[PDB]
Amino acid sequence: ICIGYHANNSTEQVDTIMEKNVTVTHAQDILEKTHNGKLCDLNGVKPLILKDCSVAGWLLGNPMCDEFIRVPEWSYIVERANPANDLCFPGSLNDYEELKHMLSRINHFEKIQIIPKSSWPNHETSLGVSAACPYQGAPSFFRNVVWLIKKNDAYPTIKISYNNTNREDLLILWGIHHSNNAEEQTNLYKNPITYISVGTSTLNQRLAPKIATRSQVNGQRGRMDFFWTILKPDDAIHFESNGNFIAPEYAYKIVKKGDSTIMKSGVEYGHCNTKCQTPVGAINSSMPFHNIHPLTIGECPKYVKSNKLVLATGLR
């Protein structure tokens, strides 16, 4: 009578508490290491990807961003790292980070033509061009705001208002302009000590421009500071301006909510259909652990920071 170990042949090993290399026959693996390598669609809906545009560029309607105007329903946002298009003008939008964070829970948009161009009074609006953002070699400007300028040496105070009627949460953007010196201000506009005021049911604001000298960036000595707000249903909003003003033309409307993510990957686009995504590639596996990158999107498995994990069974 001879009874003993179940004989087997093996090729790999495993670690333990008291040793580092012990051979094992059923070397079961649990860690996934291989990725496809190209960006691809999620759940059959094409994600939104940009090439050189930025969030500021897209929302503010950059002249070179014209291709992206009415983007349909998407899954997630993949914006090119270190955008080149971005904002051609050397401005600065207040609290960019909170806006970017807010954009992480929206799955659809709709542009609403709230304030028609013809509705504007005698106030001149056709001289708002800039050489910093050329189009086909010609001066141009943003395609989402209107820079009102004096006409016949006049500038009546603007007292527009708006009431939100549709059951949706509108989003509004506008801006203010910092000139360079006194003569420029009195040339473009009519009077000094300009101010703007915003009125709603939740906040107030009263601002004036800053006039001083600065360095030269892109051959310009002026600045633009933008601002934004969220409007509740059945609410009202009021604007007043005695001078410098960046009036809005198009508003944004939210119609769906869900899950999204801001992304900073570097790969091109392919034709596919996956379930998860990482900044280097897609995943088509079932293991519960991976170590490609901790910043995943979707129902991806968990992330660790190691190199070898074996849950093998068997003798030896």
Epitope: D66, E67, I69, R143, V255
Partner: antibody
């Protein structure tokens, strides 16, 4: 603008159709979305797909796996290829152009060509 | 997906009088439909692209309006060249920009 359609009149079943729409007078130098529309009896008008000048493409989900658009900057010629003709219903095809940014960029097909048919 | 359907099929009208067309959708769309009219042997031309604008077509002769899931065109006058086939489409979401059914108005 003079939008012209160059078709071969392909018939051979289990073949690969290829119609090449070329733009005259104008050129591919502005923001637009060229499109294909096919008209067939019994179901009217179907939208085939669109493609921007930078390389972005949108296809019909019905024939996405079998249809492909290509473009040529050299002489501004954009073409369609469908790899199987057994599903073709001898519909009449047209290549058309939408509106520019001055109109708000709505997805409507403004300008249309002469149109040409094909049979299997 | 969004599916389009119009109930009436054939209308028989006299010149100069008032006619209505109906366009009945399947889901909330907003203001994102368009209308097309086809002449025999010719490509269509644009008449209504936004739900409440008339930048394309012939002014002061046609009109269309609606919301929710129901839309309607009125003319209040028509000439000998207005008899054609009319189509209703949506453009609220991509890719499947499906087209509506056909209807024929004639003497």
């Amino acid at each position: 603008m003079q939008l012209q359609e160059s078709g071969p009149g392909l018939v051979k079943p289990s073949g690969t159709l290829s119609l090449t729409c070329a733009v005259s007078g104008g050129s591919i130098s502005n923001s637009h979305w060229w499109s294909w529309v096919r008209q067939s009896p019994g179901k009217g008008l179907e939208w085939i797909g669109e493609i921007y000048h930078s390389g972005s493409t949108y296809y019909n989900p019905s024939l996405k796996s079998r249809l492909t658009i290509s473009v040529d900057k050299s002489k501004n010629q954009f073409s369609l290829k469908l790899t199987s003709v057994t599903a073709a219903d001898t519909a009449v095809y047209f290549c058309a152009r939408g509106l520019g940014w001055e109109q708000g960029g709505y997805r409507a097909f403004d300008m249309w060509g002469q149109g040409t048919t094909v049979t299997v | 997906e969004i599916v389009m359907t119009q109930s009436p099929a054939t209308l028989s009208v006299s010149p100069g009088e008032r006619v209505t067309l109906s366009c009945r959708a399947s889901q909330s769309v907003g203001s994102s439909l368009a209308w097309y009219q086809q002449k025999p042997g010719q490509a269509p031309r644009l008449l209504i692209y936004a739900a409440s604008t008339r930048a394309t077509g012939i002014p002061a002769r046609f009109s269309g309006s609606g919301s929710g899931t129901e839309f309607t065109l009125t003319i209040s006058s028509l000439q000998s060249e207005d008899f054609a086939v009319y189509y209703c489409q949506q453009h609220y979401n991509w890719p499947p920009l499906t087209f509506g059914g056909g209807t024929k108005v004639e003497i």
